Amino acid sequence: FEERIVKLKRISKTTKGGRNMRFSVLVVVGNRKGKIGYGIAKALEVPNAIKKAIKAAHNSLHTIEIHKGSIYHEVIGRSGASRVLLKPAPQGTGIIAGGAIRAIIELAGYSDIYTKNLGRNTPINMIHATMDGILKQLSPRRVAILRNKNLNE
Amino acid sequence: MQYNIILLVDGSLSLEQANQVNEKQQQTLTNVEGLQTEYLGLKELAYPIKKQLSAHYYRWKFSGDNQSTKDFKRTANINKQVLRELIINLEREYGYLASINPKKQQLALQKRAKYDEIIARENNPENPDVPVTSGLASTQPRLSRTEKAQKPKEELWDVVQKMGNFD
């Protein structure tokens, strides 16, 4: 349960005099066993918002399968119109990615990955899109069993 | 082309001049005929329409070629003995369905509805009963049959059970 943070969003809501600063945070929780969970929350100060996001993220932990531990099929993930493209990197080309993308990929237990972030650079939807792209991939066993043809090729 | 004509004669004058109007309009229809000579008596006109406040109502329902309409209207409007010359055709839209005998139940039951003031009727003028048999006659038929069959497939019955067991 590392509960690693990725990005804090500086926000402020206008009210009757002054502006209440309730800056949000987004955290990712994992325990080096493939567990992944994302959680966004907010509070008056840093520690309370971090704790709330940690609770929200740790409330749901997910593990993804590893086979040829890259994204072994080209796929682009979009979460709120944010392009994050992951394509299979061979196991000897070295990992080349972005910092948030590297964090998301390595927290899931994968290896070198051909990533490309596009357009906007707001890390909240970047993390959301990267999570959607990585988690929507299917396992070879999935198609091997769901299809009547047992052979996976 | 279906045709109707409604003639309104000059004012509250005698029916003799209404018959004169009939005779005058007879020659206006050159060769397209089928008219029926009927009169609806003397009926008042509420507002000043052209110059008068009453008339005698006549209707002639002919059919055929649709070219004998403009001349009719202009000669009846020019003639002072006529205040309304109206001619009705396809721009009036109505029903002449080939299957009208299934509506005879409606024919009887609306006359019953218009006579609902008698105790002998249980059906209200607006009574929800849904008596229609919902006939369709609305399927485009086609004769075909299969040629191949392979790999029968079945699945479990459509009642979801989470984990199937919790013992």
Binding site: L138, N148 | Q150
Partner: protein
């Protein structure tokens, strides 16, 4: 299986296949209908042979001229359909032709490609083995 009503022809038949299958899986439907071509009956049969969709029935009314096909979608015991979203490759205006040297393997040895090389529909493995290339028709995985 008598249709009791003839379906209306699409602009193109493979797009009709795609639309019918996608709207069937979208509307939680199990039976799909499409036109019947020798190419299209062949592609449906080869999809069935690889465990992607269920029984198919070719329906001929009075001649091969009016021929359609109704096929059931495969549904695994886990209520997961074997059709993960069919796609066409022989697209009108996007006709992509790959030689034998350019026959790919679908998402790194997970899916199945439909290739009519020189004599009929052939799956990816036999197409590579047969050292013959040709048109790639549809992608189902």
């Amino acid at each position: 299986i008598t249709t009791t009503k003839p379906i209306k022809a699409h602009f193109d038949p493979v797009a009709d296949l795609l639309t019918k299958i996608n709207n069937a899986r979208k509307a939680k439907l199990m039976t799909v209908t499409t036109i019947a071509s020798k190419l299209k009956i062949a592609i449906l049969e080869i999809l069935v042979k690889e465990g992607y969709l269920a029984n198919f029935q070719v329906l001929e009314n009075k001649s091969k001229t009016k021929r359609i096909v109704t096929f059931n979608l495969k549904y695994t015991q886990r209520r997961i359909p074997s059709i993960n979203g069919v796609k066409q490759i022989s697209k009108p205006g996007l006709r992509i032709y790959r030689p034998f040297e350019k026959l790919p393997l679908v998402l790194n040895g997970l899916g199945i490609a439909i290739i009519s090389t020189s004599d009929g529909v052939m799956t990816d493995k036999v197409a590579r083995l047969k050292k013959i290339g040709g048109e790639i028709l549809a992608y189902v995985w």
